[PDB]
Amino acid sequence: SLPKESQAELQLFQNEINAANPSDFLQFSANYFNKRLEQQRAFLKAR
Amino acid sequence: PKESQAELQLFQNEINAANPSDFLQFSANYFNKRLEQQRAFLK
Amino acid sequence: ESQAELQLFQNEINAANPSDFLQFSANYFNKRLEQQRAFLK
Amino acid sequence: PKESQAELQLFQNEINAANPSDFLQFSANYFNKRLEQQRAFLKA
């Protein structure tokens, strides 16, 4: 029953998992979420 | 794979149980902690 | 700012003396990012 | 400890070699990657 933004981020993640089918699910998933944060951090740091 | 489906089901269960205010931060914290838990076993 | 964040990190390493340096350091920096994200948002 | 001093010296060397625009993001990425590298060795 999640909010729309949460469903969108979960759908993007599920799409990435199905496209890559990582041999190390946890490492791929941690790298993915740490990169999504990194992307939003660039907006937050900007002048 | 079955291990991937299990880890994805565990994550989806955590998201539905917590319904985080910051989805990205909760998800990064979750996966970093799952790695930390497996590191203890692997060392 | 970089020297101050490096000094804070070195101080944390010397105060905690972790048995797992890499895990402590990754947790530390991931938490510093988490803290800054809240303030920036 | 010797292993901790070596990892701290490697990190300080990386900071001086890259001089990152975003110190915190570079440092988090660095330690997360050092863990990733050790995970591959531990799983082998």
Owning domain of residue A29: 23-47
**How is residue C18 annotated by DSSP?**
-
DSSP per-residue string spanning A1-47 = ---HHHHHHHHHHHHHHHHH--SSHHHHHHHHHHHHHHHHHHHHH--
Q: Which residues of A20-41 are buried (b: 16+ CB within 10 A; e: fewer)?
A: eebebbbbbbbbbbbebbbebb
Nearest to B31 by CA among C22, D20, A24: A24
**Experimental technique for the deposited model:** X-ray
Kindly give, in sequence order, each residue whose CB lies less than 8 Å from that of residue A44, ignoring residues fewer than 6 positions away: C36, C37, C40, C41
Query: Using an 8 Å Cβ cutoff, are D25 and A13 in contact?
Result: no
The structural domain count of chain D equals: 1
CB contact under 8 A, A30 and B28: yes
| Cβ atoms within 10 Å of A15's Cβ, excluding its own | 10
Alpha-carbon distance A46 to A29, whole Å? Answer: 26
Which of D4, D24, D31 is closest, CB to CB, to C5? D24
Which of D7, D20, D28 is closest, CB to CB, to C21? D7
CA A19 to chain centre: 13
Which residues 1-40 of chain D have a CB within 8 Å of chain C?
A: 1, 3-4, 7-8, 11-12, 15, 20, 23-25, 27-28, 30-32, 34-35, 38
